[PDB]
PDB file of C-alpha atoms and ligand atoms in Angstrom:
ATOM      1  CA  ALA A   6      39.166  67.281 -21.904  1.00  0.00           C
ATOM      2  CA  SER A   7      36.728  67.450 -18.973  1.00  0.00           C
ATOM      3  CA  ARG A   8      34.526  64.794 -17.770  1.00  0.00           C
ATOM      4  CA  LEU A   9      31.102  65.231 -16.127  1.00  0.00           C
ATOM      5  CA  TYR A  10      30.493  64.966 -12.258  1.00  0.00           C
ATOM      6  CA  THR A  11      27.472  66.709 -10.195  1.00  0.00           C
ATOM      7  CA  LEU A  12      27.404  67.853  -6.693  1.00  0.00           C
ATOM      8  CA  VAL A  13      24.180  68.213  -4.959  1.00  0.00           C
ATOM      9  CA  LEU A  14      23.212  70.521  -2.033  1.00  0.00           C
ATOM     10  CA  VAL A  15      20.251  69.807   0.177  1.00  0.00           C
ATOM     11  CA  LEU A  16      20.015  72.836   1.347  1.00  0.00           C
ATOM     12  CA  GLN A  17      16.627  74.533   3.862  1.00  0.00           C
ATOM     13  CA  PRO A  18      15.642  77.588   5.237  1.00  0.00           C
ATOM     14  CA  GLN A  19      17.997  76.623   8.687  1.00  0.00           C
ATOM     15  CA  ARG A  20      20.436  73.661   7.313  1.00  0.00           C
ATOM     16  CA  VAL A  21      22.560  71.715   5.341  1.00  0.00           C
ATOM     17  CA  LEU A  22      23.793  68.599   4.232  1.00  0.00           C
ATOM     18  CA  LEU A  23      27.006  67.416   3.936  1.00  0.00           C
ATOM     19  CA  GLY A  24      28.436  63.987   3.471  1.00  0.00           C
ATOM     20  CA  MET A  25      31.778  63.499   5.092  1.00  0.00           C
ATOM     21  CA  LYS A  26      33.798  60.909   2.261  1.00  0.00           C
ATOM     22  CA  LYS A  27      35.064  57.807   3.867  1.00  0.00           C
ATOM     23  CA  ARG A  28      36.487  56.686   1.120  1.00  0.00           C
ATOM     24  CA  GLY A  29      38.649  57.379  -2.364  1.00  0.00           C
ATOM     25  CA  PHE A  30      38.488  61.254  -3.911  1.00  0.00           C
ATOM     26  CA  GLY A  31      37.811  63.363  -1.132  1.00  0.00           C
ATOM     27  CA  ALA A  32      37.801  61.143   1.291  1.00  0.00           C
ATOM     28  CA  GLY A  33      37.913  62.590   5.388  1.00  0.00           C
ATOM     29  CA  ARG A  34      35.671  65.952   3.976  1.00  0.00           C
ATOM     30  CA  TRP A  35      32.715  67.465   3.789  1.00  0.00           C
ATOM     31  CA  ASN A  36      30.935  68.112   0.977  1.00  0.00           C
ATOM     32  CA  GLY A  37      27.291  67.771  -1.011  1.00  0.00           C
ATOM     33  CA  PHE A  38      26.562  64.000  -2.630  1.00  0.00           C
ATOM     34  CA  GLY A  39      27.679  63.653  -5.975  1.00  0.00           C
ATOM     35  CA  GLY A  40      29.641  61.499  -8.614  1.00  0.00           C
ATOM     36  CA  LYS A  41      30.467  60.325 -11.979  1.00  0.00           C
ATOM     37  CA  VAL A  42      27.711  61.189 -15.094  1.00  0.00           C
ATOM     38  CA  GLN A  43      26.758  57.485 -16.501  1.00  0.00           C
ATOM     39  CA  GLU A  44      26.554  56.634 -20.569  1.00  0.00           C
ATOM     40  CA  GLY A  45      22.995  57.491 -21.661  1.00  0.00           C
ATOM     41  CA  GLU A  46      22.517  59.306 -18.708  1.00  0.00           C
ATOM     42  CA  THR A  47      20.970  63.819 -18.253  1.00  0.00           C
ATOM     43  CA  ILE A  48      23.067  65.725 -16.047  1.00  0.00           C
ATOM     44  CA  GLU A  49      20.179  65.769 -13.650  1.00  0.00           C
ATOM     45  CA  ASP A  50      18.966  62.291 -13.893  1.00  0.00           C
ATOM     46  CA  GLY A  51      22.811  61.207 -12.671  1.00  0.00           C
ATOM     47  CA  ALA A  52      22.719  63.968  -9.649  1.00  0.00           C
ATOM     48  CA  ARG A  53      18.809  62.380  -8.626  1.00  0.00           C
ATOM     49  CA  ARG A  54      20.983  59.065  -8.711  1.00  0.00           C
ATOM     50  CA  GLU A  55      23.720  59.881  -6.720  1.00  0.00           C
ATOM     51  CA  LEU A  56      22.051  61.789  -4.142  1.00  0.00           C
ATOM     52  CA  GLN A  57      19.848  58.157  -3.990  1.00  0.00           C
ATOM     53  CA  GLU A  58      23.572  55.988  -3.375  1.00  0.00           C
ATOM     54  CA  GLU A  59      25.276  58.241  -1.038  1.00  0.00           C
ATOM     55  CA  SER A  60      22.283  60.565   0.738  1.00  0.00           C
ATOM     56  CA  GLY A  61      19.589  57.446   0.835  1.00  0.00           C
ATOM     57  CA  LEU A  62      17.646  60.956  -0.318  1.00  0.00           C
ATOM     58  CA  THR A  63      14.707  60.799  -2.751  1.00  0.00           C
ATOM     59  CA  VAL A  64      15.046  64.231  -4.628  1.00  0.00           C
ATOM     60  CA  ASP A  65      12.052  65.276  -7.905  1.00  0.00           C
ATOM     61  CA  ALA A  66      12.921  68.370  -8.799  1.00  0.00           C
ATOM     62  CA  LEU A  67      17.027  69.257  -8.586  1.00  0.00           C
ATOM     63  CA  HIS A  68      17.612  73.557  -9.612  1.00  0.00           C
ATOM     64  CA  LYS A  69      20.605  73.969 -11.356  1.00  0.00           C
ATOM     65  CA  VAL A  70      23.184  76.531  -9.450  1.00  0.00           C
ATOM     66  CA  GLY A  71      26.375  76.167 -10.798  1.00  0.00           C
ATOM     67  CA  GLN A  72      29.247  74.775 -12.553  1.00  0.00           C
ATOM     68  CA  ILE A  73      32.472  74.443 -11.125  1.00  0.00           C
ATOM     69  CA  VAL A  74      35.335  73.043 -13.296  1.00  0.00           C
ATOM     70  CA  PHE A  75      38.164  71.901 -11.066  1.00  0.00           C
ATOM     71  CA  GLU A  76      42.050  71.519 -12.526  1.00  0.00           C
ATOM     72  CA  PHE A  77      44.827  69.489 -10.621  1.00  0.00           C
ATOM     73  CA  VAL A  78      47.926  70.595 -12.627  1.00  0.00           C
ATOM     74  CA  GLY A  79      49.786  66.938 -13.255  1.00  0.00           C
ATOM     75  CA  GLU A  80      46.328  65.182 -14.191  1.00  0.00           C
ATOM     76  CA  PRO A  81      45.166  65.753 -17.679  1.00  0.00           C
ATOM     77  CA  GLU A  82      41.470  65.782 -17.152  1.00  0.00           C
ATOM     78  CA  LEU A  83      39.374  68.573 -16.088  1.00  0.00           C
ATOM     79  CA  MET A  84      36.779  67.566 -13.666  1.00  0.00           C
ATOM     80  CA  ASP A  85      32.911  69.901 -14.719  1.00  0.00           C
ATOM     81  CA  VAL A  86      31.191  70.158 -11.781  1.00  0.00           C
ATOM     82  CA  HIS A  87      27.346  70.617 -12.231  1.00  0.00           C
ATOM     83  CA  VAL A  88      26.248  72.212  -9.329  1.00  0.00           C
ATOM     84  CA  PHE A  89      22.799  71.373  -8.296  1.00  0.00           C
ATOM     85  CA  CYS A  90      20.319  72.236  -5.050  1.00  0.00           C
ATOM     86  CA  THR A  91      17.277  71.019  -3.822  1.00  0.00           C
ATOM     87  CA  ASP A  92      14.423  71.884  -0.566  1.00  0.00           C
ATOM     88  CA  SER A  93      12.306  68.816  -0.702  1.00  0.00           C
ATOM     89  CA  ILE A  94      13.535  65.732   0.055  1.00  0.00           C
ATOM     90  CA  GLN A  95      12.415  62.360   0.978  1.00  0.00           C
ATOM     91  CA  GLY A  96      13.858  59.590   3.162  1.00  0.00           C
ATOM     92  CA  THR A  97      16.189  60.361   5.819  1.00  0.00           C
ATOM     93  CA  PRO A  98      20.310  60.335   5.107  1.00  0.00           C
ATOM     94  CA  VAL A  99      21.465  56.354   5.853  1.00  0.00           C
ATOM     95  CA  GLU A 100      25.546  56.272   6.872  1.00  0.00           C
ATOM     96  CA  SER A 101      27.196  53.442   4.836  1.00  0.00           C
ATOM     97  CA  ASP A 102      30.732  52.528   4.399  1.00  0.00           C
ATOM     98  CA  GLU A 103      31.095  54.887   2.214  1.00  0.00           C
ATOM     99  CA  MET A 104      29.137  58.496   3.357  1.00  0.00           C
ATOM    100  CA  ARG A 105      28.401  59.873   7.293  1.00  0.00           C
ATOM    101  CA  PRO A 106      25.606  62.603   6.004  1.00  0.00           C
ATOM    102  CA  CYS A 107      24.601  65.089   8.655  1.00  0.00           C
ATOM    103  CA  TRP A 108      22.964  68.335   8.943  1.00  0.00           C
ATOM    104  CA  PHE A 109      24.465  71.651   9.679  1.00  0.00           C
ATOM    105  CA  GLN A 110      22.809  74.762  10.216  1.00  0.00           C
ATOM    106  CA  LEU A 111      24.270  78.018   7.843  1.00  0.00           C
ATOM    107  CA  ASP A 112      26.289  79.596  10.736  1.00  0.00           C
ATOM    108  CA  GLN A 113      28.550  76.257  11.589  1.00  0.00           C
ATOM    109  CA  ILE A 114      29.010  75.271   8.507  1.00  0.00           C
ATOM    110  CA  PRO A 115      32.631  73.310   8.550  1.00  0.00           C
ATOM    111  CA  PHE A 116      35.057  75.464   5.893  1.00  0.00           C
ATOM    112  CA  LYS A 117      38.134  73.654   7.375  1.00  0.00           C
ATOM    113  CA  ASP A 118      36.764  69.903   7.024  1.00  0.00           C
ATOM    114  CA  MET A 119      35.479  70.740   3.392  1.00  0.00           C
ATOM    115  CA  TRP A 120      37.867  71.092   0.160  1.00  0.00           C
ATOM    116  CA  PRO A 121      39.073  75.100   0.145  1.00  0.00           C
ATOM    117  CA  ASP A 122      36.806  76.123  -2.759  1.00  0.00           C
ATOM    118  CA  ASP A 123      33.953  75.823  -0.798  1.00  0.00           C
ATOM    119  CA  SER A 124      34.240  78.505   0.860  1.00  0.00           C
ATOM    120  CA  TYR A 125      33.999  80.892  -1.908  1.00  0.00           C
ATOM    121  CA  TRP A 126      31.003  79.532  -3.407  1.00  0.00           C
ATOM    122  CA  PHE A 127      29.363  78.014  -0.703  1.00  0.00           C
ATOM    123  CA  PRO A 128      28.624  81.117   0.392  1.00  0.00           C
ATOM    124  CA  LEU A 129      27.232  82.466  -2.580  1.00  0.00           C
ATOM    125  CA  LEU A 130      24.735  78.964  -2.774  1.00  0.00           C
ATOM    126  CA  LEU A 131      23.458  80.013   1.015  1.00  0.00           C
ATOM    127  CA  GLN A 132      22.127  83.557  -0.590  1.00  0.00           C
ATOM    128  CA  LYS A 133      20.606  82.005  -3.137  1.00  0.00           C
ATOM    129  CA  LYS A 134      22.768  83.235  -5.974  1.00  0.00           C
ATOM    130  CA  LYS A 135      24.229  80.823  -9.619  1.00  0.00           C
ATOM    131  CA  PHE A 136      27.871  80.958 -10.793  1.00  0.00           C
ATOM    132  CA  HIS A 137      30.096  79.739 -12.773  1.00  0.00           C
ATOM    133  CA  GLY A 138      33.808  78.880 -11.637  1.00  0.00           C
ATOM    134  CA  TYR A 139      37.576  77.360 -12.413  1.00  0.00           C
ATOM    135  CA  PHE A 140      39.435  76.298  -9.748  1.00  0.00           C
ATOM    136  CA  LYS A 141      43.571  75.258 -10.687  1.00  0.00           C
ATOM    137  CA  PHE A 142      44.870  73.004  -7.706  1.00  0.00           C
ATOM    138  CA  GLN A 143      47.621  72.239  -6.244  1.00  0.00           C
ATOM    139  CA  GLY A 144      47.564  68.821  -4.662  1.00  0.00           C
ATOM    140  CA  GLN A 145      44.022  68.682  -2.676  1.00  0.00           C
ATOM    141  CA  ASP A 146      45.032  72.342   0.162  1.00  0.00           C
ATOM    142  CA  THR A 147      46.493  74.065  -2.217  1.00  0.00           C
ATOM    143  CA  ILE A 148      44.417  76.671  -5.127  1.00  0.00           C
ATOM    144  CA  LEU A 149      46.811  78.361  -7.452  1.00  0.00           C
ATOM    145  CA  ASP A 150      44.587  79.987  -9.472  1.00  0.00           C
ATOM    146  CA  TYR A 151      40.777  80.628  -9.063  1.00  0.00           C
ATOM    147  CA  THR A 152      37.675  82.408 -11.225  1.00  0.00           C
ATOM    148  CA  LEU A 153      34.078  83.059 -10.318  1.00  0.00           C
ATOM    149  CA  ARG A 154      31.819  84.115 -11.394  1.00  0.00           C
ATOM    150  CA  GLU A 155      27.596  84.887 -10.414  1.00  0.00           C
ATOM    151  CA  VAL A 156      25.482  84.297 -13.412  1.00  0.00           C
ATOM    152  CA  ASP A 157      21.950  84.262 -14.670  1.00  0.00           C
ATOM    153  CA  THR A 158      22.035  80.638 -16.239  1.00  0.00           C
ATOM    154  CA  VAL A 159      23.657  77.738 -15.155  1.00  0.00           C
TER     155      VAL A 159
HETATM  156  O1  KOX B   1      34.381  71.134  -2.892  1.00  0.00           O
HETATM  157  C1  KOX B   1      35.560  69.974  -4.038  1.00  0.00           C
HETATM  158  N1  KOX B   1      36.587  70.829  -3.977  1.00  0.00           N
HETATM  159  C2  KOX B   1      37.165  70.272  -5.276  1.00  0.00           C
HETATM  160  C3  KOX B   1      37.045  69.483  -5.489  1.00  0.00           C
HETATM  161  C4  KOX B   1      36.059  68.734  -5.626  1.00  0.00           C
HETATM  162  S1  KOX B   1      36.139  67.226  -6.286  1.00  0.00           S
HETATM  163  C5  KOX B   1      34.877  66.419  -4.946  1.00  0.00           C
HETATM  164  C6  KOX B   1      33.632  65.665  -5.887  1.00  0.00           C
HETATM  165  C7  KOX B   1      33.218  64.794  -6.291  1.00  0.00           C
HETATM  166  C8  KOX B   1      32.290  63.875  -7.068  1.00  0.00           C
HETATM  167  C9  KOX B   1      32.064  64.652  -7.593  1.00  0.00           C
HETATM  168  C10 KOX B   1      31.905  66.010  -7.586  1.00  0.00           C
HETATM  169  C11 KOX B   1      32.585  66.182  -6.273  1.00  0.00           C
HETATM  170 CL1  KOX B   1      32.501  68.532  -6.216  1.00  0.00          CL
HETATM  171  N2  KOX B   1      34.906  69.575  -4.593  1.00  0.00           N
END
C-alpha cells in the first residue's frame, strides 16, 4: 500500500543544506536528500546511502525527526517518507547531473521553490520538534487535505 522513502536534512545552528533536483520527480524544487529504500537495507542505512549519492556527504548518526505519508490522487501507491536530521557531516557538497546542493540561512529557506507541504513541517524541524504528517495532493502544487501532529517518538 505504501513504499518506503527517506529524506535527510543537514541542519546546523545557522544554516540548512538543500538540493535543487535537476531531473525526475520534484525536478525544479529545493528539498532534502533522499530516495527509495532498497531490499535488505534498513531505513536508516538507506537514508545514509541516499545522502552520499545525492550530496557527496558522509553522515554517521542520523536522528529520526518525522514520518510523512504522501498521497497523489489517481496514483495507487502512498509514499511513506522517513525524515532524518544531522548537524555533523564529512565532505563538501558536490553538484552532479541530478542535484545542485546549496547552503541556506534559516531565515532564507526558499519555500516558494519547495513542495508546498514543506511550509508546514520544516518550521517544526527548525525548532527541533518531531512529527507525523499526511498530505493528500492533486498533482504537485495543490494540497487537498492534510494532517500534521507533533510526536515524542517518530
Ligand atoms: O517535500 C516533499 N513534499 C511532497 C513530496 C515530496 S517527494 C520528494 C522525495 C523524493 C524522494 C524521497 C523523498 C522525498 Cl520527500 N517531498
